[PDB]
Amino acid sequence: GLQIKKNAIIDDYKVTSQVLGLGINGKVLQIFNKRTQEKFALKMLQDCPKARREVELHWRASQCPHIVRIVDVYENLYAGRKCLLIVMECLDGGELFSRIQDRGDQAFTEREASEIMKSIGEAIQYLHSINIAHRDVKPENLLYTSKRPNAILKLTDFGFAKETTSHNSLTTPCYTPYYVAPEVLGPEKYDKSCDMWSLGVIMYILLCGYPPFYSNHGRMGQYEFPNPEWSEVSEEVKMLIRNLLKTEPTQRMTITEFMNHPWIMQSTKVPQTPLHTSRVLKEDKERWEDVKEEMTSALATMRVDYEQIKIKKIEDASNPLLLKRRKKARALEAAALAH
């Protein structure tokens, strides 16, 4: 029910120069609706089908409290460009994991860790309920509303989100042949499932304060659960994670299962056991960047890029090398007729 507005946004809001952080696709400004004096962030994209879907999706999703509210969408010309200006709920609360590092420390708990997840869980559950995959659930798209203690957590940036198909995944049999059969292509199976993979990783970090990746040298997971940090954690929690990180998209845990699991379903009453995460995240700001960077890297391999090209059949393909060699086929053909 999104009514993209046609007039100049400045008729309705005052656009300030106060910068609220640089966006992927431009600069996010503070603005103020003139009628209410309410404050809002203003992000902006270039107008084009992708962007107009991206915003439709986000508009729909906005109904979820753990998703950042699109308030209003204008279509104007900025800097010689057709633009979608997007007025959004302002979020002054920083990234999720930064909050944890910013602590007394009141030790970060397990009960605290469960809510955070349930929140992220609700946001997906909503998204998936209406057949939409956000495909970039990661720590920099998970902002709190504010510095205040009642602050709510929210999922943001719909730049990789897309509508997807509600299809049952089959549950693979116990007995299989030695041979590798051909894949039945179904790219869409990497959609929702991507979101479930990210929940697994963010949960893993949340609990210990490092990621479940390897290192290259030889504080890195390797999909084990190192003592000491993990000594205090339930085996039912670890199995959640293994089931979340299942490398087969058709076999991986589905958000419904996630949100039924007791550690979630009954989070209000989860063991209070304290956690290392904050003191670990404090250890090395430089390392935590590499966490963020590898997670973004990993996600690329776990979602399809439906934007990328298809490879022409070879006899329809032409390029330097492809002729260099064909040009040699005919040089031999000719040489043999010529003598």
Binding site: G21, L22, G23, I24, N25, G26, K27, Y178, Y179, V180, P182, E183, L185, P187, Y190, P211, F213, Y214, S215, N216, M220, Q222, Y223, E224, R242, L245, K246, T247, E248, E286, E289, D290, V291, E293, E294, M295, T296, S297, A298, L299, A300, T301, V304, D305, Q308, I309, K310, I311, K312, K313, I314, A317, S318, N319, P320, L321, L322, K324, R325, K328
Partner: protein
């Protein structure tokens, strides 16, 4: 040569006015990439802003390393540097390195999820990958982290091998040879795993934890015999392996059903455990799979580039002024 500023990928980019239409693209992982257009050359280019290049010494070193690699990489099936620039006017301002490159269409990681590559596709792509490695290998350089998401391909099935950073954290390593869990042949194992995936649709060895990864590998290529057992380093490695139900390698003809016999043959030679018995890139290109594309008078080597001060240990500013030298001293390729 003047620049313009522009807010993109969460930082203030300033690039030469020759590069227009900066659109972001790709993961945006280890530095951020933008699709552009280069009016000087006339064609379409990937422009990459290095991320946090002089934060640590560790970084500062790698940036310098990466750069000299890239400056010495002149091959059709390898990522090559069209341009490198900096808005800085002197070492005192030196803050950001930018790199320009050809722009491709897709990566093979993504191609495999979307498309049923024919045998001819597989011939041509693995050809181009191996053609590339021979060069890389002749330069005394191991790629290490070779994988499908480093194989850039455009729509006419051109292939270029990307990403020499290793030559931090890595999410999975399905394509990593068991030794490095090492010769150049480490790279051939990756080409092994990749070819497998192109032929099949599926990751060959989609291991979960590390234990798992090893079992999955060994489940294809057999457990080692005592001869090659003795060559393993860690005692607890030797044990683990000997704690398994022991078994021979299997006929790849029985695994890769309906593949091209020649492909299977080659795949057999690429995925051998004994690294000292594994086929080289040079050798691979001669294999009969690639009849259609093997031309030895156009499978060029590289000339080597020295250690210089890459086995010298230095302060940040020391790597920083060395990198500057390489940026200013870069010279473009012929138009």
């Amino acid at each position: 040569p003047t620049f313009y500023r522009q807010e993109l990928n969460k930082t203030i980019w300033e690039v030469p006015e020759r590069y227009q239409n900066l659109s972001p693209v790709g993961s945006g992982a280890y530095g951020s990439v933008c699709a552009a257009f280069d009016t000087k050359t006339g064609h379409r280019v990937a422009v990459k802003k290095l991320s946090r290049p002089f934060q640590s010494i560790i970084h500062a070193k790698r940036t310098y390393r990466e750069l000299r690699l890239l400056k010495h990489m002149k091959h059709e099936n390898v990522i090559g540097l069209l341009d490198v620039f900096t808005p800085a006017r002197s070492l005192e301002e030196f803050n950001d390195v930018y790199l320009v490159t050809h722009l491709m269409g897709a990566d093979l990681n993504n191609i495999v999820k979307c498309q049923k590559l024919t045998d001819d596709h597989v011939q041509f792509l693995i050809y181009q990958i191996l053609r590339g490695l021979k060069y890389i290998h002749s330069a005394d350089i191991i790629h290490r982290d070779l994988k499908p998401s480093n194989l850039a391909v455009n729509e006419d099935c051109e292939l270029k091998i990307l990403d020499f950073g290793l030559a931090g954290y890595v999410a999975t390593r399905w394509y990593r040879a068991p030794e490095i869990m090492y010769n150049q042949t480490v790279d051939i194992w990756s080409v092994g795993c990749i070819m497998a995936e192109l032929l099949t649709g599926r990751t060959l060895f989609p291991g979960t934890d590390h234990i798992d990864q090893l079992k999955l590998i060994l489940r294809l290529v057999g457990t080692p015999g005592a001869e090659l057992l003795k060559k393993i380093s860690s005692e607890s490695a030797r044990n683990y392996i000997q704690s398994l139900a022991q078994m021979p390698k299997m006929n790849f003809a029985n695994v890769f059903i309906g593949a091209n016999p020649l492909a299977v043959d080659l795949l057999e030679k690429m995925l051998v455990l004994d690294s000292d018995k594994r086929i080289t890139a040079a050798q691979a290109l001669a294999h009969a799979y690639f009849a259609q594309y093997h031309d030895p008078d156009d499978e060029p080597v590289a000339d080597p580039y020295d250690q210089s001060f890459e086995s010298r240990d230095l302060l940040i500013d020391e790597w920083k002024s060395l990198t500057y030298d390489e940026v200013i001293s870069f010279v473009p390729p012929p138009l």
